Amino acid sequence: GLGGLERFCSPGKGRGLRALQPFQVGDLLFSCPAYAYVLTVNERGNHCEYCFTRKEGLSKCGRCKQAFYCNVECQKEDWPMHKLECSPMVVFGENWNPSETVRLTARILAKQKIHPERTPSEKLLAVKEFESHLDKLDNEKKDLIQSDIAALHHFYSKHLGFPDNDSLVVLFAQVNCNGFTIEDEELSHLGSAIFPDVALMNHSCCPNVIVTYKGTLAEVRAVQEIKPGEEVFTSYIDLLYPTEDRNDRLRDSYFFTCECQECTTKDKDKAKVEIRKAEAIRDMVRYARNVIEEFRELLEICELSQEKMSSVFEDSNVYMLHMMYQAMGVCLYMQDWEGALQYGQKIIKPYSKHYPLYSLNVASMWLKLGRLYMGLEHKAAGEKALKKAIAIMEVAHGKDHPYISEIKQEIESH
Ligand SMILES: Cc1cn(CCN2CCN(c3ccccc3-c3cc(C#N)cc(C(=O)NCCCN4CCCC4)c3)CC2)c2ccccc12
Ligand SMILES: Nc1ncnc2c1ncn2[C@@H]1O[C@H](CSCC[C@H](N)C(=O)O)[C@@H](O)[C@H]1O
Ligand SMILES: [Zn+2]
Ligand SMILES: [Zn+2]
Ligand SMILES: [Zn+2]
Ligand SMILES: [Zn+2]
């Protein structure tokens, strides 16, 4: 088990995690080593495949030239998993395209073969026990799973053979319902992983813990006081958006509707959809929500949307903020640093009011802003922004987190 915590039956939520003892803000509840994990293709060469350390001068796999490592030991330790892809990448070349979900699922299957017994990743919840919601899958989801199975068979048969279709339908469903993305300090996608004990926690829009990552290790820290017997809740989703938007995503992705305090009262809905006629507002919300999914030179789509929404929506409106954030990202890709800074400066204050006290989204925006300032020679403003990020991260990531050490070095180097 896990010290100070227990698995229990949470009414209407299946299994959950319950506190045996109190936890205060910032306390580490537990840490969970990844059961299986994969570095995203676009981050190859930036992070070690084995331990996810971000550093320059990584060593390259001599066989495939498409995996990178801290050293020969990280390389050796990753081989049981990397061998699933090493030769196939060479053989298939530009015709190697398994989805990240397929890549992760292959690693689960490999791990099951070499380590059938319960792992240190499964102290309270085992991978084989994962919820699948099999009976709730529509044709779209079932078709996607069949595509994933076809790709698994085609790309990974050398080490995995051709696993039974029925058993793979269940497993792919489980991976979708329980998989985690690993993100860096700016919430940029690093890869995907299975953290079985972390997956036990149910969702709230007023979560009492935040999950962060230290390489491939998941860490769970309190962001509210937790009393004996209280359920431990994490957020599955971006908390910026209004109640209907949040629950549409929870229904589609996780087959539940949230009944937390934020969802019951809808307290923050008004401030999120701040107006500067009822039918005009509803038509604008419908438009904004549709336009977001369309994105889900792209600046035009953002600029036109902002102008159109400006007629009804104030600047602090979450739909306005969303577009500003997307525009900022595009400017960051084009390397229009001044453009991205202008958007970031407009985002940060209203953005910080919509999120909870400790939010990774807010910390990451402060970091982006801080690094833009530093790059554009605004060192005083950069230092202040980076310190704002650190204040949140000390609670969420722990005071001793490598990210905090790095950010402090950025303050000292500038
Ligand atoms: C049965 C079924 C559900 N789907 C939909 C699933 N989709 C979302 C998940 N996807 C992933 C899949 C693998 C690994 C990670 C992810 C992933 C994506 C995002 C995002 N963007 C965010 C996160 C993340 O870490 N979210 C934070 C909370 C994670 N907790 C929640 C509970 C424990 C983990 C995790 C695949 C697509 C299907 C779709 C098709 C067929 C069946 C199904
Ligand atoms: N706030 C909530 N209300 C209802 N169900 C929830 C919930 N948060 C999580 N869940 C359930 O938990 C799943 C995610 S995995 C979390 C552990 C799960 N309760 C289990 O027994 O294995 C979701 O698909 C949903 O079925
Ligand atoms: Zn390494
Ligand atoms: Zn290789
Ligand atoms: Zn909720
Ligand atoms: Zn609350």
Residue numbers in the entry: 5 to 280, 287 to 306, 316 to 433
What does the paper say about this structure?
SMYD2 is a lysine methyltransferase that catalyzes the monomethylation of several protein substrates including p53. The SMYD enzymes display a distinct protein architecture in which the SET sequence is split by a zinc finger containing the myeloid translocation protein-8, Nervy, and DEAF-1 (MYND) motif followed by a cysteine-rich post-SET domain. Like SMYD3, SMYD2 also targets a number of histone and non-histone substrates including histones H3, H4, and H2B; p53 (15); retinoblastoma (Rb; Refs. 16 and 17); HSP90 (18, 19); estrogen receptor α; and poly(ADP-ribose) polymerase and is implicated in both cancer and muscle development. SMYD2 is overexpressed in a significant percentage of esophageal squamous primary carcinomas, and that overexpression correlates with poor patient survival.
A 1.63-Å resolution crystal structure of SMYD2 in complex with LLY-507 shows the inhibitor binding in the substrate peptide binding pocket. LLY-507 binds in the substrate peptide binding site of SMYD2 with the pyrrolidine group ensconced in the lysine pocket formed by the side chains of Phe184, Tyr240, and Tyr258. The nitrogen atom of the pyrrolidine makes a hydrogen bond to an ordered water molecule, whereas the oxygen and nitrogen atoms of the methylene amide linker form hydrogen bonds to the main chain amide nitrogen of Thr185 and a bound water molecule, respectively. The benzonitrile group makes a C–H···O hydrogen bond to the main chain carbonyl of Gly183 with the nitrile group oriented toward the solvent. The piperazine packs against Asn180, and makes C–H···O hydrogen bonds to the Asn180 side chain. The indole stacks between the side chains of Lys145 and Asn180. The phenyl linking the benzonitrile to the piperazine sits in a pocket formed by the side chains of Thr105, Thr145, Asn180, and Ser196 as well as the backbone amide units of Val179, Gly183, and Phe184. The high resolution structure of SMYD2 in complex with LLY-507 reveals the significant overlap of the ligand binding site with the substrate peptide binding site and provides a plausible rationale for the selectivity of LLY-507 for SMYD2. LLY-507 potently inhibited the ability of SMYD2 to methylate p53 peptide with an IC50 <15 nm.
